[PDB]
Structure formats: structure tokens, C-alpha cells
Amino acid sequence: DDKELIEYFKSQMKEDPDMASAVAAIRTLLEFLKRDKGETIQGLRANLTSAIETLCGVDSSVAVSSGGELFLRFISDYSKCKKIMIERGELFLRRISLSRNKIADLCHTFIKDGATILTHAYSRVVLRVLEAAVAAKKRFSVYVTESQPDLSGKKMAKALCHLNVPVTVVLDAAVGYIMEKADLVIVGAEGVVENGGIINKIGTNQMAVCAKAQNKPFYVVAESFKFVRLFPLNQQDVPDKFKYKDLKEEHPWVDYTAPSLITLLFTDLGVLTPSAVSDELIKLYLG
Amino acid sequence: MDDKELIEYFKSQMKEDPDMASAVAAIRTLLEFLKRDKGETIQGLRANLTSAIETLCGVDSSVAVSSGGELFLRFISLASLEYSDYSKCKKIMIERGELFLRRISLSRNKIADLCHTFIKDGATILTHAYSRVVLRVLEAAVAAKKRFSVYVTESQPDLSGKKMAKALCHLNVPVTVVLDAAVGYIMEKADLVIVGAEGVVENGGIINKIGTNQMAVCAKAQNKPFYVVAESFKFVRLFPLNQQDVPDKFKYKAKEEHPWVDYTAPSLITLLFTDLGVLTPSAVSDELIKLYLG
Ligand SMILES: O=P(O)(O)OC[C@H]1O[C@H](O)[C@@H](O)[C@@H](O)[C@@H]1O
Ligand SMILES: O=P(O)(O)OC[C@H]1O[C@H](O)[C@@H](O)[C@@H](O)[C@@H]1O
User: Fold this and answer.
1) Which residues on chain B are in Cβ contact (under 8 Å) with A235?
2) What are the N6-acetyllysine sites (modified residues) in this protein (chain A)?
3) Does residue B105 sit at the A interface (CB-CB below 8 Å)?
């Protein structure tokens, strides 16, 4: 049922925080598929399409939608069928579970010794990369935006001081001021779109614009289940459902960064240029 | 007066008149030092005027205080020529001082007239933090019955922008407040950007509340006009080429680095609206040089 379909999901996220919202949903979809007491290939298919959607309502991050779409895609005689569906699904889950590791290996080599890295907000993938640089005995320092409204940035600084890397938290407003001190920018993303750009915490776009104006490379680190079937041209093309996950106050939770503002993306599919994403997205979705 | 003498006065001057420019607050305090100074020698006076200026900059790091001071002191220090008795100078210095104070009393309005042209109707304007000059430029637009909308950042860490939004709301001007982090996100929705300045430096760049550089750089990438409204007394004798060149004096009012102002290069500025006329950044040096020489 939905209500403890949701509680399973939320519970899977509450007990492991550093678990991606997507992967949490896949396990909730996997477990749902297991407990499904139906008797029709047909009613199973529907109820899964109802479960994925029910999950997308409670947490409307773009990655739980795209990851959900990809996992259900990968799942392609009810007694028989059901079983191997679960085995394909558990194979798919097994693969996206090494994604963070392969990214760490890939990206951390682009960090020169004595580099000072500028990042935005909290990214579990960025932190795994920087952890891998510490593992590789590389010495570096970090600037991170405090990142209103939830102040994820201090969460990242505190995590980063536990590995004894010098980290300084700056105001969101000070990114233009601090850009000259950085040698490169690394950020994560909630979603990677078809044109090679990204959807990430509000403030990413302006960091990328200030980075291009001082010719500082701008690197993105994201798993391939974040590849989403969208092609934005402006900020209004990002669907409002992923944007909120006479005085007034607008407050979007993420903005969009165009491919022209992005140097490379480091992914479990390999190092990519923004223009190259489209060919890799096709291969990813058809497979 | 003495040191806590000036500080108490100066702090009180702005305490009761919030809209009063900080530099003007210093000029009045400095004037009151000339009126209350009972010394009886010329350069001992001047020399101690050069200590009140420095003692004042200690409590308010705004770079306008230093610039406005030096221009007033340099302007009144022309009294010594052809006024030998220390009591003759003093009298005409006070005179020249209140003359000076009266000129800059006209600076905000002279600006709000020069800039009402560039606010076309139906315009969407973006600004940063709270600027009394910006506020008066818009007051003049609404006064001329012109229709326009505003976006403004909240501007950490004091949320000055929520106070700028409060005022424009009282003008029934449609306004919206966004996060400092959303300026890149919101730029496309704006037709032009207008900010104030704490200081206009010798290359036509500005020193202004932290977050101004961000906005300027994002405005250039979308080809949006970036207009600066600033009084002629904010012209400071500094030539910063980057953020490091901004002296620590004015950068902090006092690991987490929290500067209060950044530098915005002339490359990033379309026009400056000052009480000396509408200037391109490149025309600010020669204008500044004249101002400090006459
Ligand atoms: O890299 P992660 O942790 O998966 O999340 C990626 C992104 O999620 C959110 O949008 C924010 O927290 C960003 O800071 C982060 O980059
Ligand atoms: O326009 P004014 O009142 O001179 O303000 C000068 C400046 O003061 C501070 O630096 C900030 O509040 C800025 O927003 C403002 O531009």
C-alpha cells in the first residue's frame, strides 16, 4: 500500500542519509515488486507505474524521477517474469552502487597539489572525490558557499575538516569576490540534462558564470542515473515540479547551468564534455 | 573636542537621521570640531583635523567617510591662503564647510533627475541590498507616474534587501526578494540593474556591499545595463584592480571569511549617475582628478 510504500522509502532514507534519494527509491521499488501479491503481469506493471509516481510525489528531486524511469526501463508467465525482473532490478541496483566510486577515481586526478577548490553547498559526490584526493596523498584547500537557505555549506565544511583539509565558508554573495583565489570549481548536480548542462542547488549558475569570466575550469561530478530527458534553454524551462522540491519572495531550490558554462562532467560513464552527453544519454536510455 | 567627543556626536548624528549619508555624518562631526575647537594655531588645528578624520574612520569602515572627509578638508584648507589670523581662517573655514555641506545636500536629487530617463515603463529592475540613492531614483520614477517592477536580493548577512523591499512596497511598486544565490537565476527576468556604491574608485570601478561583483558579472553575460548611482563625495583615491587590492580597512567592519564589500571593475559598469553628470567608467578618473584639484 502507498502509505507504508512511502514510509519504507522515507525510512530507507532516514536510516542512511548519505544514500542518494534515487537509490532509496529503487530499493523501495524493488522491495515493492517483491511484496507484490498480484497475479497478473498486467496489474503488476500498472501498480509499479503507480508506485514510482507515488514516490515522485513525496520527494520530487529530478533524480528520483529519472532514476525511476531508468530502472523501470531496465525491467523489460507472471511467476517466471516477475522473478527475473527482480534479478534485473537487483543487477541495475548493483551497478549504480559503484557509480560514486568510479567517479572518485576519475575526477580526483584533476586536482593538482596545492590546488584551492571552490564548491557550492553539500554534495555527497564531491566529498567522495575530495576524500579520494586525500587518499591519494594530495594536499589542497577548499572554499565552499554557505548556501542559503538550509546552509548545506557548513555541513560540507564540517565534513571536510574531519579529514583535515583547510576549508573556508563564504557567503553566497561572496562567490564573485572569492573566485580569483580558486584554481578550479567542482560541484555536483541533481540532474544532467540532454544538452550537457545541469540542475543543481540555487547558486550554481552564478558560480559557473563567475568561473567562466575568470577562466577557471568548472567541473561537475554526478552519477549517470541523474541523466534526465529535458532540454532547457532558460531557467523557466526547468519544470516547476523539480524547482520547489505588492511584496513577494521567489525561492527556487535549484537553478540551471548551460553547457557553455561547464568544462567537463565526471560520471560513471566516463569523462564527458557537455556536447557529448547527448550521445551517452541515448546509449544509457536504450540500454 | 576629544576622541569619544567626535565618536559620540558622529554616532548620534546618524542615529537620529538614518537617511543621512555616513560621509555627511562625518562632515558634520568634523564641522562641529572646527566650531568647538578652541586651539589657537593654524596647522595644529589642521593637523588635529587630520586625526579626527582618522579617529572617525575607526568606528565606521565605510570608505565614503574617508573620501568625503579628505575632500571636505582639502576644500576648506584653501581658507588659509589670504586669511592669516587663525581666527579669520576658522570663520571662513566654517563658512566654506557649510557651503560644502549644502552642495552635497543636492547630490541625491541631482542624481534622481539624471536617471529617470533610463527607467522606461514596463521595466523590470534588479538591485542589490539597500541604497538610499537607488531608493530616491525610484521614488522619482513612481513620482513621475512611471510603471515598473523590482527584484532585489536579501543581501546577507544583515538582510538590507528586505528593508529595501519594505520601502518599495510602501510606494506600491511591485517588488520581490530573492536569495543572494538566485541572482544568476533571476537575471534573465530583468531589463536592467541599478546599484548604489560605498565608493567610486579611480578607474571608474565601485566598492559596494558584498554581492555586487556577482550581479555585475552576471549582468554582463546576459548584456543587461549595469547602472551605478553614487554621490560625488564617494570618489575615493584608490586604484584596486582586484579584490585583494581593496584595503582591509574598508573590507571588514570588524574558518569563515565575511567581507562587507567587493570591487566591481569598470569593465562591468555601463554608466555612473553622479551629481557631476552621467559618466562612463572611463570618464571617472579625469572627473575625479578635477574634483580633487578644485
Ligand atoms: O551530489 P549529491 O549529494 O548527490 O547531490 C547533488 C546536489 O544535491 C542538491 O542539489 C544540493 O545538495 C547540491 O549541493 C548537490 O550538488
Ligand atoms: O546608496 P547609499 O545609501 O549610499 O548606500 C551605499 C551602500 O551602502 C552599503 O554598502 C550597502 O547597503 C549598499 O547597498 C549601498 O549601496
Assistant:
1) 185-186, 188
2) 34
3) no
Query: Which approach determined this entry?
Result: X-ray
- Name beta bridge partners: B11: none
The residues near B249 (Cβ < 8 Å, ≥ 6 apart) are B57, B61, B63, B66
Q: Ligand 2: residues within 6 Å at CB?
A: B 21, 128-134, 160, 195-198, 208-209
Q: Which of A190, A201, A194 is nearest to A272 (CA)?
A: A194
Q: Which residues face B262 on adjacent strands?
A: B208
Structure-block grid coordinates of residue B103: 552642495
Q: For residues B127 and B194, is the Cβ–Cβ distance under 8 A?
A: yes
Set of chain B residues whose Cβ sits within 8 Å of the Cβ of A201: 181
Helix-helix angle B63-76:B22-36, to 10 degrees: 40
Instruction: State the DSSP H helix or E strand holding residue B135, giving kind and residue range, or none if neither.
Output: helix B132-143
Q: How far are the Cα atoms of A62, A230, A285, B169 from residue A278, in angstroms, in the given order?
A: 18, 11, 11, 46
Classified by CATH at the fold level, domain A99-286 comes out as Rossmann fold (3.40.50)
To the nearest whole angstrom, how far is the Cα of B23 from the nearest Cα of chain A?
25
Q: Which amino acid is at A211?
A: A
Contact A191, A234 (CB under 8 A): no
Contact A170 B258 (CB under 8 A): yes
| Sign of CA pseudo-dihedral B182, B272, B270, B140 | positive
CATH topology (fold) of B110-292: Rossmann fold (3.40.50)
3-state secondary structure of B154: coil
